[PDB]
Design a protein around this ligand. Structure first.
Ligand SMILES: NC(=O)C1=CN([C@@H]2O[C@H](COP(=O)(O)OP(=O)(O)OC[C@H]3O[C@@H](n4cnc5c(N)ncnc54)[C@H](OP(=O)(O)O)[C@@H]3O)[C@@H](O)[C@H]2O)C=CC1
Ligand SMILES: NC(=O)C1=CN([C@@H]2O[C@H](COP(=O)(O)OP(=O)(O)OC[C@H]3O[C@@H](n4cnc5c(N)ncnc54)[C@H](OP(=O)(O)O)[C@@H]3O)[C@@H](O)[C@H]2O)C=CC1
Ligand SMILES: CC(=O)N(O)CC[C@H](c1ccncc1)P(=O)(O)O
Ligand SMILES: CC(=O)N(O)CC[C@H](c1ccncc1)P(=O)(O)O
Ligand SMILES: [Cl-]
Ligand SMILES: [Mn+2]
Ligand SMILES: [Mn+2]
Ligand SMILES: [Mn+2]
Ligand SMILES: [Mn+2]
Lengths: 410, 416
């Protein structure tokens, strides 16, 4: 059986992880949900605890610790280990009764648990792309020390690229490892995108778009943060960098492609020019499941893809003029160093400002552009400990700088 | 990263045809990047002059002409070529001697129709890697080849047919190594749940039933993109090619018929898709060009660099998929019925189609007469006990094949 832990179990990813796990278990008892971890959603967590009965429960907000223990106490025949915050998170990561950990925690915050899951040589099903954009080089170093740890991508596009690769070569290397794309004969990557809701707007129409126009979609809900990045397409920009680090693919070899039907989740072009792609309805259950079964696949009762029904699939190149955040991602990525870290931190700020109606669409990229321009490359620390505090320091600085540029009312 | 060349010894059967030309085309091109392919033998039927030109360029250790009438003429032309002493052979004999060479590893089978089955069975008998393009040898001898491959455990059949190359390319080779094509449980070991078999649809895809009745071989032989043999080109028009590929899929990957869906994709970019048990679908795509599937069958389990134009999805812009009308392409229905019936129906199916296809090509019968004649031959045939040992099974297959073609001819005569 596969002993899994779900970090950010109450979120979009966490819930979909639990859904797909619940269904597969009806066919055969393969997954054992050993630990659930969230920030402050104590009631929802309590509901999940009741169903799955994980040996471990962890709430990051220590101020709702008693409430949690008080609710859980109402579940008959159940004596789980209830922990709190960082220490609680680290306690779960070091347990020997846990093999894989799904990181469904959003934002920079997700980096901490990703880091500890790796330090404990676990298999990390990573959905939190911010961890790889702000600490890509750091995660690669960390993975070179804890050689049994692995980062299996959950982000649908990267899961797609991962699935397209021949596992006979994948097994001979590992995500984030040097020469990954060379060992897999990777020539180029077609990074597919839904295009977001503003994809067909003219410049004048984009100028006045709002966060209310961009948030709601109809296949499944996602966090507000990622929903907004999807709108500005900064999501795909962050995903370009994530692709670079995860598969050691050069930036001039990643092509963003807008595929509005979202059936083809991404394609991989090999050195002979043949192209392999992964496809299915826009659902996160597949990428999450594959991250937990790889290198194997298991039966599910998901609705089969009906191509005749879908009938049409379209492709076009995004306009960098309308979606300038994509260009900024490439530039920060190509500059390397801590620019990707600055890009992400300043976007967290610009993103939230837009969400809360504080700035307009183009102010988002402008703010981010200015922070990237202000930052000066720093010598990359030699050991992980210092490199970590450096990433944190630069992250905080980029955010204060973004806020500052904004505070001058731009 | 460098030119650490470890050459691949290859033989090209049917080197002067569509597959053979495309084969040498890609070998020639990849060798300009890093000399990795060494053609040890070429083998044609009657095209002695074109074979001559190929020998001059590739200088293969072996040369073979199947028709004895041009054997001497071949030995003549080759004389000119200086500093070249190849072993010129002829007929079946020359083909068996080539398959038995120890200097050859991979044999590309580009021989058309039923004839391709002979060299196919002999390549397997010599434990060679068979980059099989000839689908007929698989439809009419599927379970024979299966038994043959269980005896010659080192022999392997790598598919060159585009759709089937696509499916194969979508698999994890760490699972494929535990088995091999045309072996029971291939789909289970690879967790294959279902196959989407793509088709160009052919030239009659938008014609009405009344229009179809009067279409001709001339209208079917004008495929706007590249050159292929006349049989397959007609088979593509009636979509019997796809029906044959349905059975080919069943035998190559052990996929149930009710798990094979024929889909019409006119852009011909997505060459086929593989649905795994989790419902995830992986597909192989590129411009419709036989060079990739051919090249892949010779590089597997690896891939090598090429200078082929890169697929440009943006330019392509649109991809369409739709169910094929069984009313307009009844040949598809017949293929499924024969495959599902098992035993020797596929053999009867392929044989009667060969007759029906040729009759149409020479404007002797009409579009719906093809589907009708095959239907009659199939209903006329009755199961037969499957022979245990391969030699007798091979006879039985040759017997049923000849019986089927003869039957189809009778029906044509009683009608004319
Ligand atoms: N949703 C999607 O389809 C996709 C998401 N992703 C990525 O996956 C990540 C998560 O996304 P998503 O599920 O949408 O986000 P959500 O906002 O829906 O959920 C975030 C989850 O993380 C938890 N969390 C927040 N802070 C902490 C903390 N300090 N300690 C423990 N848990 C915490 C939340 O708990 P609480 O409920 O208590 O607040 C919540 O369960 C993001 O990095 C995103 O970019 C990538 C591809 C697709
Ligand atoms: N062409 C294509 O794009 C595709 C073809 N295929 C399959 O590949 C096979 C070949 O097709 P294609 O190339 O179109 O056919 P062609 O008619 O173009 O070529 C047939 C080749 O086989 C040779 N040949 C015929 N009989 C013999 C024999 N007895 N001994 C040695 N060689 C012989 C011919 O030699 P000669 O020139 O001397 O007559 C010729 O080189 C078919 O089974 C087809 O279904 C599958 C997918 C795509
Ligand atoms: C589903 C997923 O992996 N995402 O990263 C959400 C991103 C957006 C998305 C939305 C719907 N389907 C696919 C992707 P986009 O950034 O617009 O491509
Ligand atoms: C390219 C190939 O492998 N074929 O078998 C030719 C098949 C025909 C074809 C023609 C043109 N392009 C692709 C396929 P169709 O049967 O119409 O799909
Ligand atoms: Cl598998
Ligand atoms: Mn994504
Ligand atoms: Mn794969
Ligand atoms: Mn400066
Ligand atoms: Mn084909």
């Amino acid at each position: 059986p596969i002993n899994v832990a779900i970090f950010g179990s109450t979120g979009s990813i966490g819930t979909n992880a639990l859904n797909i796990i619940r269904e597969c278990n009806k066919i055969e008892n393969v997954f054992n949900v050993k630990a659930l971890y969230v920030n402050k959603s104590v009631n929802e967590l309590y509901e999940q605890a009741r169903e799955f009965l994980p040996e471990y429960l962890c709430i990051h907000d220590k101020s709702v610790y008693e409430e949690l223990k008080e609710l859980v106490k109402n579940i008959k025949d159940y004596k789980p280990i209830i922990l709190c915050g960082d220490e609680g998170m680290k306690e779960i990561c070091s347990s020997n009764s846990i093999d894989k950990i799904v990181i469904g925690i959003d934002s920079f915050q997700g980096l901490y648990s990703t880091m500890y899951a790796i330090m404990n040589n676990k298999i990390v099903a990573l959905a939190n792309k911010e961890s790889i954009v702000s600490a890509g080089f750091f995660l690669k170093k960390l993975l070179n020390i804890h050689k049994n740890a692995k980062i299996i991508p959950v982000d649908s596009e990267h899961s797609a690229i991962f699935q397209c690769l021949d596992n006979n070569k994948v097994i001979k290397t590992k995500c984030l490892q040097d020469n990954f794309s060379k060992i897999n004969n990777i020539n180029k990557i077609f990074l597919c995108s839904s295009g977001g809701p503003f994809q067909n707007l003219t410049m004048d129409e984009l100028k006045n778009v709002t966060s209310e126009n961009a948030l709601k979609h109809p296949k499944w809900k996602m966090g507000k943060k990622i929903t907004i990045d999807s709108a500005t397409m900064m999501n795909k920009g962050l995903e370009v960098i994530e692709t670079h680090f995860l598969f050691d693919v050069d930036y001039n070899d990643i092509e963003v492609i807008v595929h509005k039907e979202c059936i083809i989740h991404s394609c991989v072009e090999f050195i002979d020019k043949s192209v392999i792609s992964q496809m299915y309805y826009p659902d996160m259950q597949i990428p999450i499941l594959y991250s937990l079964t790889w290198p194997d696949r298991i039966k599910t009762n998901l609705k089969p893809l009906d191509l005749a029904q879908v009938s049409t699939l379209t492709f076009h190149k995004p306009s960098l003029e309308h979606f300038p955040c994509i260009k900024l991602a490439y530039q920060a990525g190509i500059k390397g160093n801590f620019y990707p870290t600055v890009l992400n931190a300043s976007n967290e700020i610009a993103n939230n400002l837009f969400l809360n109606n504080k700035i307009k669409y183009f102010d988002i990229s402008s703010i981010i552009s200015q922070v990237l321009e202000s930052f000066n490359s720093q010598k990359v620390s030699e050991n992980s400990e210092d490199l970590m505090k450096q990433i944190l320091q630069i992250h905080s600085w980029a955010k204060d700088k973004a806020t500052d540029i904004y505070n001058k009312h731009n």
